[PDB]
Design a protein around this ligand. Structure first.
Ligand SMILES: CCCCCCCC/C=C\CCCCCCCC(=O)O
Length: 132
């Protein structure tokens, strides 16, 4: 599968790594009852004062918004990212989350965005996943 760019206007990403899956697969396997480690290498094209992350699961061609626990990336002590972000400098975001047993097993497209304080997209990543 491909970590597709779903449109960003104030940055780009170069690499996404999800511990439970490899891009050689048809869909990204997300294992329940396990810790998932996610990394993104990205570069803002402008100086960024604050970052708010957004996630969506695609259903019926419509991206449905899903709540994140720590959307203010720069204020999360474990993210590895400190604001302000400098223009043209590649940095890396890190996050670990645990997928509960109570998580339904399904296949869906995931859309994941980092926005700045101005609600402009720094990154937009889209990929197919299978929770299994
Ligand atoms: C309930 C299971 C959720 C399904 C797993 C989604 C997998 C997508 C992988 C990476 C993009 C999401 C990154 C956000 C990490 C969550 C941390 C948080 O709650 O802020």
């Amino acid at each position: 599968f491909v970590f597709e760019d779903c449109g960003s206007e104030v940055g780009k990403f170069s690499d996404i790594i999800i511990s439970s899956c490899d891009p050689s697969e048809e869909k990204c396997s997300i294992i329940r009852e396990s810790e998932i480690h996610v990394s993104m290498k990205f570069t803002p094209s402008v100086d960024v004062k604050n970052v708010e992350a957004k996630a969506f699961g695609v259903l019926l061609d419509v991206p449905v918004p899903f709540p994140l626990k720590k959307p203010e990336i720069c204020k999360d002590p474990d993210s590895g990212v400190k604001c302000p972000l400098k223009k043209d400098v590649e940095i890396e975001y890190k996050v670990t989350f645990f997928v509960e047993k109570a998580t339904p097993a399904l296949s869906l497209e995931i859309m994941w965005e980092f926005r700045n304080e101005k609600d402009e997209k720094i990154t937009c990543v889209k990929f197919p996943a299978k929770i299994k």
